[PDB]
Amino acid sequence: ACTKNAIAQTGFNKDKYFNGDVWYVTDYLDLEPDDVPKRYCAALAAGTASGKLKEALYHYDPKTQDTFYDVSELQVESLGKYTANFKKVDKNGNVKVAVTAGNYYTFTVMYADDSSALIHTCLHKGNKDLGDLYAVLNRNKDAAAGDKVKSAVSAATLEFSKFISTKENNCAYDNDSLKSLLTK
Numbered sequence: 001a002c003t004k005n006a007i008a009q010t011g012f013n014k015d016k017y018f019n020g021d022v023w024y025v026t027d028y029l030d031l032e033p034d035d036v037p038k039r040y041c042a043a044l045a046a047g048t049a050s051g052k053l054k055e056a057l058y059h060y061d062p063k064t065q066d067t068f069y070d071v072s073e074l075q076v077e078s079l080g081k082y083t084a085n086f087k088k089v090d091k092n093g094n095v096k097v098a099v100t101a102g103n104y105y106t107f108t109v110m111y112a113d114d115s116s117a118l119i120h121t122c123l124h125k126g127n128k129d130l131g132d133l134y135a136v137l138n139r140n141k142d143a144a145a146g147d148k149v150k151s152a153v154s155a156a157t158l159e160f161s162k163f164i165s166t167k168e169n170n171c172a173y174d175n176d177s178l179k180s181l182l183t184k
């Protein structure tokens, strides 16, 4: 179940966030912690492609090697708050599971600057959902969370000390696929 109406960043700069580049998840918090593994790798690209607002996602379980990519068109709910219906794709954008009603995530950018961000997502796959998930993002996959984004975590009435880091998993990413998937 999801329980949070995440508040988007005051003054959110959509063109800077959605600039076509890659964001790495460095730390995450699921409010239903058993919904996701305690060791995990994730990243995304975010941009406008031929006028359409898009995200490309990458997930990798470093223990099981379970890997998947997704491509989403985002619809606007309000500035910094989106609903994304996703299709599972291979790294080249070929469809493995088509867009389907009931398969969507909400996405709220609670904080962002040029290098760092805090997001919330509520994932739905049919009638289930994977609890509220918060993620600390960085442009540099090895960046420790700075004071700006940790302050944002506190401003959301969360504690950064409870977030789980992704940094000890030897995560390696295919940035080229994430960028090209934005067009798919």
Ligand code: HEM
Binding pocket: 025, 027, 028, 035, 036, 037, 040, 041, 042, 044, 055, 057, 059, 068, 069, 070, 086, 087, 088, 097, 105, 107, 121, 123, 125, 130, 133, 135, 166
């Ligand atoms: C747009 C930050 C994230 C977003 C937007 C996101 C989105 C998604 C989406 C769309 C799916 C379903 C993919 C599909 O079935 O085609 C998924 C599944 C999953 N995600 Fe994430 N995710 C994020 C981060 C994370 C993180 C950090 C972890 C634990 C850095 C995580 C763990 C999982 C797991 C384990 C599944 C599979 C769930 C199930 O099918 O049983 N995700 N995620």
